Amino acid sequence: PPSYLNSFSNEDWVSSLDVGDGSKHIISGSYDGIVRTWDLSGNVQKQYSGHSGPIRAVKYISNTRLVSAGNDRTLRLWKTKNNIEDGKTLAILEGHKAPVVSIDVSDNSRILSASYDNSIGFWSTIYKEMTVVDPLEDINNPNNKISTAARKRRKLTMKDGTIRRRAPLSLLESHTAPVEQVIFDSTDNTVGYSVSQDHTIKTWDLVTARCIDTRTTSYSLLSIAQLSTLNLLACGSSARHITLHDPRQQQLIGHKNFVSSLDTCPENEYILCSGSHDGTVKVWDVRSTSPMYTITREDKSVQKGVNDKVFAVKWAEKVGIISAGQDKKIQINKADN
RNA sequence: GAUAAGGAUUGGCUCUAAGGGUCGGGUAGUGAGGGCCUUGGUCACGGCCUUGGCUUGCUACAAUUAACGAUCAACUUAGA
Structure with missing residues (x-):
């Protein structure tokens, strides 16, 4: 059973999380516009400051590279050097016209961004x-x-120095409502499944920058995850359930609010975690239809319905399950057999 | 119709609410950011980690009659 291991506090709400492929640092985006790196001991190692609005998504590019997005329509590439280190904005990436809410990074040095301008940005790591x-x-x-x-x-918009600014490689525009998440194909690196608020899952041909296939769902979709090892797509919707789709069926129920984030267990092939706005994380087996463990926020000062939400959940193969949301605490759960 | 006239060269008293909006000021020193450079290791012209040289910030003297200039937006003959 996933047991509460450790928890460290923040100043404001946490909206995103990332650990990277191989590392021990935890990357957190906050609602103050500050990106923080932790070393599994509750001590801030690197700070990234400069975003105008709250951070909505952070991703790990390299040991000295990060990409962050926020309410301001600017992706920011951060480069560090390798006490407390202060990263510098390597670049600013513009052209979304509405707040950016998700980012993903591929193997071939590419970025996919989903924003509330019912459009997707195809970006490059190399500016x-x-x-x-x-x-x-x-x-x-x-x-x-x-x-x-x-x-x-x-x-008055250029008072923070003259920072480099770049245009998107392409704009994938087919959705009719704000896009909530976009991910790369775990194998192809050219296929770009995304979910939006217009009740659809759309797959994209990144080479030609067009929509290939569209699937219509009964309710708006808020999170998407891929299980390429068994070929399924888990889309958590605003209808408090996760739909399983075959990208060429079953639905997981038990959540009581919007399902905001999803992630997949790295060691087990059938297990995926889901965080929702009701303050509870749940681990699910794909073959079943009921949660097998339900993690709750371990805090004395938290209230179940007043300030208790899960905006970000992450399956880190070396430390466990990382949860963050309305409560400023970043919670770690064992989740190892 | 106010404002001293209405073929001419129209400019017309003192004090006293408002008279469309907005923006803008020097010379020097040092910190910052961009741009051209360049130097090593690293991965098949292109990345990764490192080395030395137009915008804005902080201080020091002039200007404070900016009582100036710039831009945006409005407007036409009340005489029978």
């Missing part, structure tokens, strides 16, 4: 491979009828 965008050029080269107030408003 030298993208067209640069000049914020000055909009108001300076034509300079047709831009007022002084508009010019000052535009200038």
Whole structure:
């Protein structure tokens, strides 16, 4: 049974989590716009500051590279050096027009971003491979009828230095409602299953940047995970259940609110974890239809319905199950046989 | 119709609410960010980790008659 191992606090809500492929550090995105790296002891190792709004997604690119997204429509690539280290923004990535809520990173140095502008961004880890965008050029080269107030408003957006800005490699635009999550294919690295609020699961041809196949669900979808080793797609919906789809059936029920995040057990082939806005994480066997363990938040000051939500859950193969949400604490559960 | 006239060169008193909106000021020193460079190890021209040289911040003297300038947006003959 997954037992409570350790828990360390934050200043504000935690919205995202990541551990990376092989490492011990925990990456957390918070609602203050600060990205924090932990060393399994509750001590902050690296801080990333500069996002205007709350962070909604963080991902691990390399030992010295991170990518983060937030309410401001800017992906930020962070580069560190290898007490407390302060990372520097390697690049800013623009063009979503609505807050970005999910990111994923592939093997071939590519990024997929899902935002509430019912569109998906196809981005590159290497910023030298993208067209640069000049914020000055909009108001300076034509300079047709831009007022002084508009010019000052535009200038006030560049007070935090002159940081590099890049344009997306492509815009995957077929959804009709905000997109909640997008993931790479665990094998192909060219297939881009995503879920949105328009009741659909869409698969994408990243080479041609178009939608290939669309499946319609009865309720809006909030989280998507892939089980390529047994070829299924688990989509947790706002209807408090997880639907299993065959990307070429069964539904898991028991949650009492929006299912926000999903993850898959790295050592077991049939086990996946789900976090929901009711404050409980649940581990599920694909062959069954009922939760086998239900983790709850271990805190004396937490209230079940007042401030208790799970915005991020992660299956880390070296430390267990990482949960984070409305309570500032980041919770670790054993989840090892 | 106010404002001294209405073929001419129209500009017209003192004090006293408002008179469309907005923006903008120097010379020097040092911190920051970008750009061109370049130097090593590393992975099949391209990455990864490292080395030395237009925007903005902080201080020191002039200007404070910016009583200036710039831009956006409005407007036409009340005479029978």
